[PDB]
Curated annotation (Swiss-Prot), chain A:
Family statement: Belongs to the cytochrome c family.
Coiled-coil ranges from the UniProt annotation: none
Its biological purpose: Component of the ubiquinol-cytochrome c oxidoreductase, a multisubunit transmembrane complex that is part of the mitochondrial electron transport chain which drives oxidative phosphorylation.
Parent-protein start and end of this portion: 196 to 242 of 243
Protein name: Cytochrome c1, heme protein
Length: 47, 35
């Protein structure tokens, strides 16, 4: 199964690479909601 | 100055401007002074 194995390896790695690229983009896009959050605190009335 | 016999402005200054009571002042512990 030498040649079948090599060819299947190439094709599987290629498809997983496509999935990885797309899902990485989508993950970084979704994280933009939290990576850009801003906080503010209403100050107390100190002396 | 008198509007119909009334020194309204004077009355205003004595009646129309009550003092406003704000939030109580919180004494700051000395270890919280740094900004
Ligand atoms: C090739 C195909 C197959 C492989 C594909 C691999 C994926 C390719 C990328 C995806 C494709 C789409 C395009 C890019 C999209 C953006 C990136 C993305 O997909 O992010 C998804 C996702 C988004 O995450 P996030 O929500 O932003 O939060 C993650 C960080 O905390 C966020 O923290 P941060 O944002 O503050 O910054 C930290 C940094 C952390 O991420 C990294 O470091 C990843 C990149 C590392 C390589 C960097 C190369 C360049 C370095 C230059 C030198 C810099 C200086 C370094 C030294 C300084 C010394 C003083 O974050 C990023 O880099 C995020 C991406 C920033 C760029 C945005 C896209 C720009 C446009 C793309 C092109 C740019 C111009 C170039 C032109 C085109 C070239 C093709 O990223 C991750 O999850 C991180 C991936 C890396 C993890 C590594 C650590 C793993 C830890 C252990 C787990 C595994 C255990 C088992 C391992 C061993 C098993 C044996």
């Amino acid at each position: 199964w030498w040649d079948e194995r090599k060819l299947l390896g190439y094709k599987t790695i290629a498809t997983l690479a496509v999935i990885a690229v797309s899902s990485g983009y989508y993950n970084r896009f979704l994280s933009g909601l939290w990576r850009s959050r801003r906080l503010a605190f209403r100050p107390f009335n100190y002396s | 100055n008198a509007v119909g016999g009334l020194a309204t402005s004077q009355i205003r200054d004595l009646v129309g401007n009550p003092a406003k009571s704000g939030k109580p002042v919180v004494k700051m512990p000395p270890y919280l002074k740094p900004s």
